[PDB]
């Protein structure tokens, strides 16, 4: 059948993904992914090793984009005396570094600004494009905790203003106060539920 799921890593297709799994959660700040790949080894013969610790990963589900790592965040090589020898991969959203980097703000305390103008100066140290659609708020005082992660502070500030903080399927950061409004399917029992 026309492949209902295709994956790319830096522009070379993965033709041996013996398994796959994708996730996208609204109650977090980054998606995820996991791919299992078959690997071989011939004793006393050459073997070509990639071991890419970092590169882009793309997943297309039925001819449609469904994820944008950046990729190869994890590399583990399982191995067995019996069944077989394989490899595993993992990935996360483009904002991965925000999730695992302590802020390096110029000074460390705003004088008088808005939340939008603060999130721009926090994220843009790592070149992650923002996707803002919520209402702006004016905050007389803001002072980011010294050394606190980017994930903590954005989540903390956006909780008190009813801003959802979650990723899109393209590699951006989307802050919204409601549903995207894209009407889906009528999941009816006895028709498609399992």
């Amino acid at each position: 059948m026309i492949k209902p799921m295709r994956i790319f890593i830096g522009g070379e297709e993965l033709e041996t993904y013996t398994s796959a799994r994708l996730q996208r959660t609204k109650k977090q700040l980054t998606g995820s992914l996991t791919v299992e790949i078959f690997l071989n080894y011939v004793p006393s013969k050459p073997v070509i090793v990639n071991a890419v610790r970092g590169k882009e990963i793309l997943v297309y589900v039925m001819g449609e984009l469904a994820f944008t790592g950046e990729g190869g965040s994890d590399v583990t090589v399982n191995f067995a005396k019996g069944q077989g020898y394989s490899v595993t991969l993992t990935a996360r959203g483009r904002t991965k570094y925000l999730v695992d980097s302590s802020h390096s703000h110029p000074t460390g305390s705003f004088k008088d600004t808005s939340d939008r103008k603060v999130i721009e100066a926090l994220v843009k140290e790592h070149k992650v494009v923002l996707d803002w659609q919520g209402t702006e708020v004016k905050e007389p005082k803001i002072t980011l905790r010294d050394g606190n992660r980017i994930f903590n502070e954005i989540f903390e500030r956006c909780n008190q203003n009813c801003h959802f903080a979650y990723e899109t399927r393209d590699g951006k950061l989307l802050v919204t106060d409601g549903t995207t409004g894209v009407v889906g399917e009528d999941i009816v029992l006895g028709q498609n539920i399992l």
Binding site: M5, E15, T18, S19, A20, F38, V42, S86
Partner: peptide, 16 residues
């Protein structure tokens, strides 16, 4: 360590 992929028309093998 025979392995068969998904949606693929080709298989593989490896000696252990």
């Amino acid at each position: 360590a025979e392995a068969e992929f998904v949606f693929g028309e080709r298989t593989g093998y490896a000696d252990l």
